[PDB]
Amino acid sequence: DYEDELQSERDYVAGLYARLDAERAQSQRRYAAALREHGGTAVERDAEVRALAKDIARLNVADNGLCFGRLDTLDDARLYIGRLGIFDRDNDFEPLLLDWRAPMARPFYVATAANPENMRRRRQFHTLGRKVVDFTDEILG
Amino acid sequence: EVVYDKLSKRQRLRVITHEDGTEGVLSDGDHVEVGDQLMEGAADPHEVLRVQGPREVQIHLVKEVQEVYRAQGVSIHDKHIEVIVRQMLRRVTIIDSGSTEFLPGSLTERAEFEAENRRVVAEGGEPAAGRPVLMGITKASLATDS
Amino acid sequence: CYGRSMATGKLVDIGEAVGIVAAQSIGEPGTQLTM
Amino acid sequence: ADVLVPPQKQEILERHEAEADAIERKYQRGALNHTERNESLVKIWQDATEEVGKALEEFYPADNPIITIVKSGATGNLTQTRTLAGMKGLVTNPKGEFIPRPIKSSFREGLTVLEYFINTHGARKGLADTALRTADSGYLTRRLVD
């Protein structure tokens, strides 16, 4: 039960790392290409360089401690709260991850045991390296 | 156990990607050698000079200067860069003045430091002690005797 | 130690001011870099 | 007549417009931050631009003068051909960040009033920054010579 749930969480979070790594690799490839053979006017090249560097930095900072924990809801939603917002494009941009700076992930810190924001269970990830050591849950309602 | 304190959360760690190791990203318990960069970024030439001697700073400076031109579609031979790098490392700094005429706290060239040490060891018997110093373009230019 | 002069393909002659050549070579493509 | 327009352009633009509409639908509910939405649109339209460029490269016959000039190495590049016959793509505001509204029309078919108005920012920025570029290059060359 607990072990199987931990394995499933590890698998999903590993998929999240896979998506992050693929996006970072694509950004690095585009940055390298733009440095050498962009082609055109210097302002557009510099703007592309800056944008790609910003994307690289934002993705790179999220490598460690990518996800803080699951946030189940009574409204039949499966929000994941982490460092960045990630969406599966083929699924009409289904949120695979939500940044806690977003408003939809606001309740993580506002909701309390006696004041639930229609949420069901709040999970804490003890992240270390590329996997979570374990998790501790809290039930709200 | 050498410590690095003020590292900000805005950076990421070293990568190796050995053919069979498949390290990924070093997090904890990994082993690194002298001179390897720990946190991904731009290293400090002075730190490289201290840790890895004077030869390594030559290669580091030449490679890092080249990379910009190479990645931005410009081809320049390495000899042109290392000519400037040579001037960047002409002088050494003295910890304390010995029997030599030099006053302490001054930067002097090796052609002078070594010569004066060899001349004063014969009679004075107290050659100066010093270490290599890396200088910028401006400081190196302003130090001309003319 | 300097090797051949890139402009002539032969061993550099005595008296070549390689410092000016290096400075000009480094500075000429300067306008093609990002800021 | 030599500046041909790919027939695949319209379908790509419609598909990416549908994607942009989906992003707009998602944003209003609060699932994305303002910067998140802006960079998502930027990524979507960069993908659209690269797809249009690939279609343009594949469509043009090898003997067309426009592609003959580029492929022979005489002058120009494929990005100029894309912005000429393909789509102009994303443009930047004065601060250097991409405006999330792309320039669909190419110079061959003519830009609208507001597309032309927003295209001026980059040209003005480049014409202003050329002088500083030259000054910085001259200063670096002077120091290296000295």
Swiss-Prot record, chain B:
Domain of life: Bacteria
Subunit structure, as described in the record: The RNAP catalytic core consists of 2 alpha, 1 beta, 1 beta' and 1 omega subunit. When a sigma factor is associated with the core the holoenzyme is formed, which can initiate transcription.
Job description of the protein: DNA-dependent RNA polymerase catalyzes the transcription of DNA into RNA using the four ribonucleoside triphosphates as substrates.
Family: Belongs to the RNA polymerase beta' chain family.
Protein name per Swiss-Prot or TrEMBL: DNA-directed RNA polymerase subunit beta'
Stretch of the intact protein here: 1075 to 1220 of 1317
